[PDB]
C-alpha cells in the first residue's frame, strides 16, 4: 500500500521511487 | 526531499515530480 | 470518481474538474 | 453547506454536481 | 483573504500568491 | 516559525506578508 507507506508513515525519496514505472 | 506525510493529491504530485519520464502508478488500497 | 473527503483547495479543484464549462459556485458557510 | 456535505462527509459525483452553475 | 489554517503545499501557494514579484522565503522550523 | 504562525494558527494577510522578500 502506497497510501499506507507514504500517507500514514514517511517515505524516503527511495521508498517513494518504488512506485515509478 | 521532504520528511513529511504525503497524502492524496500531494502524494500524486510527489510521484509525478520524483518519477520524471518513468511515469508512475497510483493504486490506493488501504 | 473518488470516494473521499474533499476540503478547501481540493474541493475547489474537484468542482472545477467536475463542472467543465458550466463553471460553479463556492460559498463556504460552515 | 458544501463544506458540510463534501468536506465533512463524502459527496458522490452527483452531489458534487449540485454546485455547478 | 481566507481565515483558515494554511499548511505545506497550501501555505507555499498562499505565499506565492500574496507576494507577487517580491518573491518570498519558506523555511519551516517547527 | 511560519509553520507555527500560519499552519497551526491563522495568519491574517498581513502576518503572511511578513514572509515576502
Ligand atoms: Cl490537506
Ligand atoms: Zn491538501
From Swiss-Prot, chains A, D, F:
Instruction: List S-S links within the chain.
Output: 6-11
What is the name of the gene encoding this protein?
A: INS
Question: Which organism is this entry from?
Answer: Homo sapiens (Human)
Coiled coil regions, renumbered to chain: none
**Entire protein: which part is shown?**
90 to 110 of 110
Per the UniProt record, the lineage of the source organism begins with:
Eukaryota, Metazoa, Chordata, Craniata, Vertebrata
Q: What is this protein called?
A: Insulin A chain
From Swiss-Prot, chains B, C, E:
Domain of life assignment = Eukaryota
Full protein: residues contained: 25 to 54 of 110
- By what name is this protein known? Insulin B chain
User: Which gene name belongs to this protein?
Assistant: INS
Amino acid at each position: 500500500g502506497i497510501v499506507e507507506q507514504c500517507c500514514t508513515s514517511i517515505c524516503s525519496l527511495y521508498q517513494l521511487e518504488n512506485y515509478c514505472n | 526531499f521532504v520528511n513529511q506525510h504525503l497524502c492524496x493529491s500531494h502524494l500524486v504530485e510527489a510521484l509525478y515530480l520524483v518519477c520524471g519520464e518513468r511515469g508512475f502508478f497510483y493504486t490506493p488500497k488501504t
